[PDB]
Every structure is written in C-alpha cells, then in structure tokens.
Design a binder for this molecule. Sequence first.
Ligand SMILES: Cc1cc2nc3c(=O)[nH]c(=O)nc-3n(C[C@H](O)[C@H](O)[C@H](O)COP(=O)(O)OP(=O)(O)OC[C@H]3O[C@@H](n4cnc5c(N)ncnc54)[C@H](O)[C@@H]3O)c2cc1C
Length: 534
Amino acid sequence: KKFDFIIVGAGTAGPVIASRLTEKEHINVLLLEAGGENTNELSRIPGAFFKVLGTDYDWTYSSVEQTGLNNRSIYSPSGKVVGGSSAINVGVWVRGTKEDYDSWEAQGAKGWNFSKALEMFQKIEQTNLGPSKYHGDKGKVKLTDSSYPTPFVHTLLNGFKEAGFGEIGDYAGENPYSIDIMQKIYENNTRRTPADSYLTEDVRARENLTIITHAFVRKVLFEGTKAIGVEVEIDGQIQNMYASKEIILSAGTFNTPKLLKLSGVGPREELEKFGIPVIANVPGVGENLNDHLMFTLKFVSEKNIEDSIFNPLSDEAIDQWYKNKTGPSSYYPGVASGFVSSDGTKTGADFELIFTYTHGADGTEKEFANIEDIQAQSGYSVTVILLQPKSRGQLLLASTNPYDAPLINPRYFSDSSDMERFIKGVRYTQKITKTESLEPYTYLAHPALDATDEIIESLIRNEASTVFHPVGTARMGDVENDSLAVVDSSLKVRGIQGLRVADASIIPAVNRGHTMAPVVYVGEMASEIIINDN
Ligand SMILES: Cc1cc2nc3c(=O)[nH]c(=O)nc-3n(C[C@H](O)[C@H](O)[C@H](O)COP(=O)(O)OP(=O)(O)OC[C@H]3O[C@@H](n4cnc5c(N)ncnc54)[C@H](O)[C@@H]3O)c2cc1C
C-alpha cells in the first residue's frame, strides 16, 4: 500500500486527523499506535478506570526529582492504547476560556483564536448544553453530565455561590466565573473516546485508511531536510514505512519531542552530545514544558452526607456495571468544577476548584489523627489548581536508545510567583467553609483553617501533584521571529519540509481547564490546515 500521510500516535489528536484526512478517497493514511486497540473494558468504567493505571495501558513515566516539591518524583502517566490518554483519564471536558484560545494567536500563531475554537467545537461537541454559539449538539464527541449518587452536590454548588466565588452555570459559556457539574466523554456510563468517535466501523472500513497497532515508532526518516518516512517496530521486527506527502507526529507531549530529538531535529548541543546528526537545529524542541499542579483541601463532616460512602471497585459494583451500566462503579467523586478570580479583577480565572462529596482522606493527615473509622465518615474536598503557572521545564533525552524513557522535568515551583499565588488561592478557597451551606459539614480540615503560611507551603510542596496536563514541548508560534518556536501556524516543523506536529506538544501553555478538549481542537485544526494545503 502507498501512503500520502503517516500519523504517529492514535491517541487524542492523531485519530481526529486520520479520520478527517481519509474523507477524501484518494488520500491514503497510515495511522501507527504503540499500544493495542481499546479492548480492556475496565478502562471504560467512570468510577473504576484508574485501576488500569500502571498497566500495559500506560507508559508509566515519572518526573525527575522535583526540587520545588521536596525532591519528589511525580508519577506522570500517559495512555498507550488507541485513545491514548483519553482512554485512561477521568474524562472531564473542561475546555478553557476565550483568553486561552486567543492567547495562542497573541503569542505568534496566526489564525488560532477563540473564534476558530468555537467553530471547531460545533464539529467536536455533542452536548445537551447545545445547540448554541458555545456548544455543539451534533458533533462527534458525546458529552454527558457526571453521574453522582448524592443530593449534596447541590450544597457544594450553593456554597460556591454563597462564598462570592461566582455563579452556578456553564463555565465554558458566557460567564466563565461559574461552577457546574462537569461533563465527560461517557455515553450510557461507558467511556467513548475521541478515537472511538472518529475511528468508527465506517471510518475503519475505508480502503484509504490503514491502522497498525503494536507499532512502535523509533525515528523519523529524512532525505536531506525532507521527512519521507518512519522507522517502526511491528511485533519485534523493524520496518521502514514511507509517505509521499508528509509525516505527522501525534505522539503527545512526552514522546513527540523525544522522537524529534532522536531523529536529528532539536537543540544542537544536546544532539551533538549524544552523537545525533543535526538535520535541523531547533532549540525549542523539549523546552517550554508546562503542566498544572493540584492541592486538595480535605474536610471531615459530623453531619451525614447521604449515599456518599460507596465502593466503586467491589466485584458487585463492577458486575452491576457490566450487566446494565448502573451502580456504584458509575460514580467518580470529582463531580463539579468552579472557576474563580481570587483578586476580583476578572481578567481570566486564576484558580480552578474541583469538588468531591467525600473527604478523600488517606488517614495519615495530621489533623485527622484521632478520628475513628475515617473511611466511614462523611466529608467533602476542594482541589485547588493554579491555572496559569509561570514555571517552565524540559523534556530531555536519556540516551539514543529509542526504548529509553525521556527525562521529564516540569520544574514545578521554579518560578517564585507560582507558590506566592498558590498559597493565596488556598486561603481564598477556604472561605467556602464559612458559608451557610458548607459550615454545617466542616468539622475538621486539612490543612487546618488556622494553619500558618509556612505550614500551607510545606503541605503544598509535599502533597501537590500533576493534574496530567503536560503541554508545550513543540510549541507553535512565529518561527520567523521567535527562536524558541518549534512549529508554525500550519504546524510545520521549522528547518524541515513535510513534517508536522499535532498534539498537546504544540499548545503554548496550559489552559484554564483540562487539556483533552484543546487537543481535539488541535486535531480538527490540523485536519483543516492540511486539507487546504492539498
Ligand atoms: C491519568 C490522566 C488523567 C487525565 N484526565 C483528564 C481529564 O479528565 N480531562 C482532560 O481534558 N484531560 C485529562 N488528561 C489529559 C489529556 O487526557 C491529555 O492532555 C490528552 O489526551 C493528550 O492528547 P495527545 O493526543 O497529545 O496525547 P496522547 O493521548 O497521550 O496520545 C499519544 C499517543 O501516541 C502513542 N505513541 C507515543 N509514542 C509512540 C511511538 N513512539 N510510536 C507509536 N505510538 C506512539 C501513544 O501510545 C498514544 O496513544 C488526563 C491525562 C491523564 C494521563
């Protein structure tokens, strides 16, 4: 078979592009994926999916020790399956704000703005929040409200409003400073990924689309500065596969920059250190790594929270789910999210608050030391996320061995403003415990409501963790005027012909939200851009 395009990675973005490009009969596309098809049904259960973390569905990377996080190494999973990380995530669709999408253009990516995003979300989203200017009703990706067992969700929503944080309603709509029930990529309590949605039976039956799983790409092949193919391992043997038009990397934030560097596209000094011939000196490759951190405030209640205590991992729950897609396994505790402006300026949300109707305590919290049967007690939690960290890190090669994990270093809290703002965000959030709604349910707190800045800082450095939103290691921008931009507005890699990147790696900075939705946007955008070239 003769291919026009090879797409590396059938994750979140890659599948979109394979689906769109093969709408033209004459365009042959090869889609390569290191993992298998998404056949482990446990991964599709909203309340139990996380049991597949650490398995063959996961690359199981961790960060280098983080000096800003008390030298902790941060477990940094990513999907290894058709669906990529969208196959192993909570599945919340929290796309961000106007300023997020507009900022890409402002930093040199002409044509990438909120107006285009809205146009793409009409094609992407299938939600009962639509039809509207903000939401599609008939797009490819079905979105449903999180399922929950407890009426206490209403008390959380009311508490946010009572605290003065903002309104109850659609944070992805007209008023961003709102709290809502999060929608998720589930249909009938079963995960349906973008890949499921774009690579349907019909699409896969197209003669001009070839999908190979268990295909591990080791490097991109060149003739001069022109990308012509990939070296790929299929079932313990190596093949070279070729494209007559272009190679598209959709291997995600961690593996895309690794592949680029191994292939001779990256910072000259690092490549030369490893003896890798430099085909294009692109300093930006592997730079600008950024990610969100979350810190959870936990609250134990004396007052019962009805039907809040259940076990989504029990054999009875899981069976009930297999049988008729109901029961405890339907429920993920993180159900609502609100966006706030902690300094009142409303110039873009600065914090996200994610709410559960359980304390989420492990029992080793000092403030809960003397509580009996903590797990049987009622409570709630608010996870605070600093939405626009200034810290930037690196994705480096460990070696020239294609199988070796890349070295992931977000440099969390390396920019001093991050901790400064985070401490303020925690204190802002803690006001919610004073509301008429939530004061009745706030008996003990972690951190304590009277904790010093020093105690809060220490707890953040020891307990804050990735929200799984790495971006930025092949940043899209103005490659004429910005030495650290990697790809242009057309997603073409600088210094190279016939090579594009389309995945989270091109996203300049994390959004006010979660990264699955902007990644699907990138896939729809890449598709339109490529089709309009040809
Ligand atoms: C545990 C977890 C929870 C998350 N929760 C949410 C959430 O609820 N909502 C949200 O919006 N975001 C969430 N995210 C983030 C979001 O899922 C990702 O940002 C997004 O899916 C990344 O899309 P992508 O296409 O860039 O990469 P991926 O989805 O990681 O796709 C990359 C693909 O390339 C394949 N691949 C990589 N290297 C090679 C190679 N060399 N050869 C062949 N194939 C290769 C991978 O196997 C994979 O399928 C979560 C992430 C994780 C890990």
